[PDB]
Design a protein around this nucleic acid. Sequence first.
RNA 1: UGGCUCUGCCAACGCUACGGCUUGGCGGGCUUAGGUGGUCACGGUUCUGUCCUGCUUCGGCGAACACGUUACACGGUUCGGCAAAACGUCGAUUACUGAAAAUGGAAAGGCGGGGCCGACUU
RNA 2: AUGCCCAUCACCU
RNA 3: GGGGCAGGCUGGG
Lengths: 328, 122, 111, 111, 110, 109
Amino acid sequence: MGKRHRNLIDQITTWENLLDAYRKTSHGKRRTWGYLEFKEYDLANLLALQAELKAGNYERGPYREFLVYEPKPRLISALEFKDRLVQHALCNIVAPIFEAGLLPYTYACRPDKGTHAGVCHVQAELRRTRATHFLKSDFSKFFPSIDRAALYAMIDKKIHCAATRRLLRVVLPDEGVGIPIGSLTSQLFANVYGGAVDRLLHDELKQRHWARYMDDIVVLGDDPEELRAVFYRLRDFASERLGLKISHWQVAPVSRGINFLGYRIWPTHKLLRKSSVKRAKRKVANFIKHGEDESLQRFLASWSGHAQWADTHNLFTWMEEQYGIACH
Amino acid sequence: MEPIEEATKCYDQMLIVERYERVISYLYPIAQSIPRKHGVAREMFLKCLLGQVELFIVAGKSNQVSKLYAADAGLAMLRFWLRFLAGIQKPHAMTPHQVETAQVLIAEVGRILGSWIARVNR
Amino acid sequence: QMLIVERYERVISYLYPIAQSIPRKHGVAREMFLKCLLGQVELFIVAGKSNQVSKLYAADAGLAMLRFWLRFLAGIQKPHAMTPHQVETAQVLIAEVGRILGSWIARVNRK
Amino acid sequence: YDQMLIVERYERVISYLYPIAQSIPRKHGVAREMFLKCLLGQVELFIVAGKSNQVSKLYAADAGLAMLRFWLRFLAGIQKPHAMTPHQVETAQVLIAEVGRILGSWIARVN
Amino acid sequence: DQMLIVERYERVISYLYPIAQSIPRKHGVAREMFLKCLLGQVELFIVAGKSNQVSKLYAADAGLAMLRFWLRFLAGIQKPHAMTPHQVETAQVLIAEVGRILGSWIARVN
Amino acid sequence: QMLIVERYERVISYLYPIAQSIPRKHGVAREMFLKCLLGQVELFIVAGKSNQVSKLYAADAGLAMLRFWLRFLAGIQKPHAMTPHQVETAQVLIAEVGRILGSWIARVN
RNA sequence: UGGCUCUGCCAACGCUACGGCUUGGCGGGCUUAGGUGGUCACGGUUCUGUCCUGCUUCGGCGAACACGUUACACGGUUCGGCAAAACGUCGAUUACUGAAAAUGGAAAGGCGGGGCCGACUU
RNA sequence: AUGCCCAUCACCU
RNA sequence: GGGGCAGGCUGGG
């Protein structure tokens, strides 16, 4: 929008925005100690947040230290409602001006550039271009490797408002190499950060058939040594510029399948990854032999949404044949 | 900034009230829909509906299980008011779906009240 | 004993129509009759959330107050009187709830 | 102090909210009447709390303030007419928060 | 016993309720409060009789005393006269009758 | 009791006319004021019957909320209903019945 | 919101301090976001079957039934044409203005497709 | 704890 | 030998 963006802290703290941030922060969380302690004097709290942000006295409270293991441990320390609300009030004005720069193919944390728009983008861009090959990569410990420093050169070629910038830097200190995973600010700022790779794919390297979902980056080709090139160029970039180590990569033929986004995406079929299946299979089987065949209908309905995209007709028939339950 | 602390910040009262506010937000339009006639019992229903918030709130703040049971007596009376507004209100007041819907919301508040009564009872 | 409420809810179902009927004229009596009638559910409810006989007696007092309201609304005069039939054919309903409450009082009294 | 201060600061809530609560339409006049009884009747909660310095009485003054905050939420949420523009909830919540601060300090002073 | 007081208090109500429905709309709060004290003291008697704590038989006395207050208050409440002094005298007689029964009942419990 | 009520009768006899001047607009606070004015008689009476100070402090809270009602009707009610003078004289009457309530509190404890 | 501490009228349950009140009609006035749940971004060990031991660009990816790993054909994951504009992005928190870009501020251009325009389907 | 689509319950446009 | 699948058994939940 003429570039710049030299007064976002005025829009971040507009009451009309903090109320959106409030409704977004409470969305779903309207049953949490954070919402319910905030909801009490909600608009007097947003008036001391507005005026903490409009001042600049906003300081992000303790990341409530807790984690989920799932042998992929992320320290997903929570944030106060107040802090998730400030983040939502940032990422209501700050997010559209970063997520607009995001090349269309960054199918991560963007409005309606979802997981499923991603698997569909990949499949689609796999059909068209008739990708004979594909590079899939992935960033080691992405969020705990975002330079949080060369991030704030991207968050700073696009904020220009030196109080949004200082609110961004409270919500996320410019001092680190580690974006806190599980922060609206950080999905964005990691999308933004890994958006630097999407500009080294699409801009430099001129890869026009790719998809990035946060840290995973599919790059369909046609010469798989041009994608090992692309990949080498992508890794060298994201290591030297972004401090992102690439955990896994492959330049698999489109034939191995693009394990994108908890899927597996041939030009042909988009089978969710077999771990989703196994979880679900086991979840169903457990539910059956737990007498919990009524919350299983809730899980089923939900999983059918995660799988309505995927080519899970055969799988849905199979699960209906094994247990009877109405999948779709 | 720090969210304004109400004192005696009881999660259960805050939760129950937020969930009961959904009962109110469902039932109040359909209490306020109760015709002119049936106004005494709308006002009585409304004093049971909007006045159950006070029962929860006093239960949370005057953290005394007596006021928690009194809140269950009022959620039960709110359930009656659903029964009454459906059947005994001669027009309609509450459609069976509306009773069906409200009873779901009151049941959610009933669950939270039950859990809250239980967590205090231990 | 929650057959009490579900047998009192036919007192309400009988008496509420004729409590709504009480004109603005007899409006305080109506509000108070309706608060006795519709608010006896709360008396029963409180009795059944405690099985304390005090709340059970308060439910009986409310039924007795509801009986009063019937006898009061009878001799309220003019075209607003609870017809003698309705007093009798509600006293029957209240008596059925009275029988329950009684049995409930007794169940609690002889534990 | 304490009760006198809380009430003078709560008088500002009443002075702000009574016009709003006096403005709540007759349709929302159970809301209004119960909001007014919550607003003007929170003074009695503070008064009783001052009379006792039983922290349970200043907690039931907090319950009343919480109920008053509920009423703000509710009166904003009522969409038949409306009662309390979102701004009025914001302003009232600031005043109630100031009463909340003094109640909290008073609760602490007793603790 | 509750039945006796209430039947004698029904005479208070039967006298005062017409009088309390005459109390002008101007004195409408006082009237509706008087009516809720009149019709309402029945509940106080009834609660006193269907239970027993003697506190409930005092709360019935307090209600009768409040009803007596309402009579004296409504008598000479303002220019919109609510209750004529005669009506207070007549009602006080009936309230005194139920006062006597309460008193005897309080005593028989004590 | 008897004397507290007769001195509160004087509060009522002063305040009830004021509560009745209160515009229709503020007829819900008048209703609410008059249920604390006329309803404080019940608070005094019930303390007289059930002589508990628990009942006696509720009458002092009633008296104190009646004093709040004076403050409220004088100012917070936007057509400041009660004139400042009337609050002064009523607080005289209220504090007479409060001096009686206080003495009665003291006599009981 | 059967309301008005609100009137006018009229009437009569009534009550009357004899003024009225009440009360009844009857008029007038006042009165898309959300919620819940999930969904994707739990294992550890031996055992009993059962199969693989494929593939690899050496990063890893897999196959032992989702079994045609796929509703084998498509989502709008469609098909061409464009890419002027707008959007994006680099140019740039640049030129410029002004002491200072200071919460001013471009653009030419370069790169996109995210955009556009049709077709066919939705 | 954040995102992502679903599923349901709601509720008016 | 290793490994994947479904069941053993034990925690998480």
